[PDB]
Amino acid sequence: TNLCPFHEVFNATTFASVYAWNRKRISNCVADYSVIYNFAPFFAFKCYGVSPTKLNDLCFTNVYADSFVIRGNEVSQIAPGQTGNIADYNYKLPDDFTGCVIAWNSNKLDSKPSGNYNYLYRLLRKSKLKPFERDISTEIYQAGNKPCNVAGPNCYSPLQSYGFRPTYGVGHQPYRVVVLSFEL
């Protein structure tokens, strides 16, 4: 059997940001979907590839497990075929994606009284990324008329820290999102 280490993702107590999502390739282990039931109350447990009831009966050669924390309104953009600031510059899924997206509320775990600034998202960029590709470039973004190459006039950094505090609205509260990608 040797069940897959799902506890290391859903119960890591140290999550990666959306621009550096912790890609974990699931292989050589039986996908035990029982721990997914206990690790979350299933806020946005919605699949697009296969039905959840027959998850344990299928067979896959390559399975991916991503993880990233975003605001509440940005979870609806993790579905295949969306456009925004997270579905374009931080994360991308193909149109024929076969998997499930697990999102739940972590306002009591990722929100600090003085503000949890460890979560940043890329707001603006020139072009949009490719599915399952990362962008950890810290080079400042150019938006002005002349090449600035400091953050001078109309030149800003692409990242931006999340407004996560326990008093923020549930739309802006930290929502930990997990994606179980499958390949046939």
């Epitope: 109350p41 009284p113 326990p166 008093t167 923020y168 609205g169 549930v170 739309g171």
Partner: antibody
């Protein structure tokens, strides 16, 4: 409009627990962007916040009434209850249930209140 | 630890203006919202001011709120008082640890 109503025994004994229920008529406990709260008020004193809870399970309590309160929700009948254990004679008060707005980018006003229920913890 | 301290009693004759206040002893008062609730004796509280400036539907224009971050306090300005305005006005806000902090309570009494 949305309205709330408290219900429970109007007389308790020490070393026991106080259990009240707040049936939500006109709304839905399933609705997010809202915290379901319980408020306390001793006779002749000011309001005292007991705690609220999000329908997803995020429970926030008063730092003084911790380890003695327990608020839960029931999606079946659109109700949420209060469980205040280890009651003493000083817990005689009028108990209110209210909901708070958590949609406008921050936690906000207690938009809808109940009607008030008086309990007398006596021995 | 975040507190709100209101005056114990405020009283002005009709057609005058009262200013119920509340000072945040700890924390800050601009970092969260400040709401004001009116509780008549024998009834439930009622929102009169939310988002620190706005009045809910049905609330008359005689009420108005304000926030001063220099002194770390809030206020509830009421003008043109009438016989139905005398009630207990509470100053409610939040701590950054997500704790609803109510004020001690100000019993407004319109003199007759």
């Amino acid at each position: 409009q949305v309205q709330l109503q408290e219900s429970g025994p109007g007389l308790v004994r020490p070393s026991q627990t106080l259990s009240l229920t707040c049936t939500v008529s006109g709304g839905s406990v399933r609705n997010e962007y809202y915290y379901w709260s319980w408020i306390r008020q001793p006779p002749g004193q000011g309001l005292e916040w007991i705690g609220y809870m999000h329908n997803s399970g995020n429970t926030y309590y008063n730092p003084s009434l911790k380890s003695r309160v327990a608020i839960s929700v029931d999606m079946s009948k659109n109700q949420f209850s209060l469980k205040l254990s280890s009651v003493t004679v000083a817990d005689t008060a009028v108990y209110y249930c209210a909901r708070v707005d958590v949609g406008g980018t921050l936690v906000s006003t207690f938009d809808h209140w109940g009607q008030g229920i008086l309990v007398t913890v006596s021995s | 630890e975040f507190m709100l301290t209101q005056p114990h009693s405020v009283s002005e004759s009709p057609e005058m203006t009262v200013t119920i206040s509340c000072t945040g002893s700890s924390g800050s008062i601009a970092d969260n919202y400040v709401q004001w609730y009116q509780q008549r004796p024998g009834s439930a509280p009622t929102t009169v001011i939310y988002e620190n400036y706005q009045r809910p539907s049905g609330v008359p224009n005689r009420f108005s709120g304000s926030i001063d971050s220099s002194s770390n306090s809030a206020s509830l300005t009421i003008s043109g008082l009438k016989t139905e305005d005398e009630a207990d006005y509470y100053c409610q806000s939040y701590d950054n640890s997500n704790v609803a902090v109510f004020g001690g309570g100000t019993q407004l009494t319109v003199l007759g």
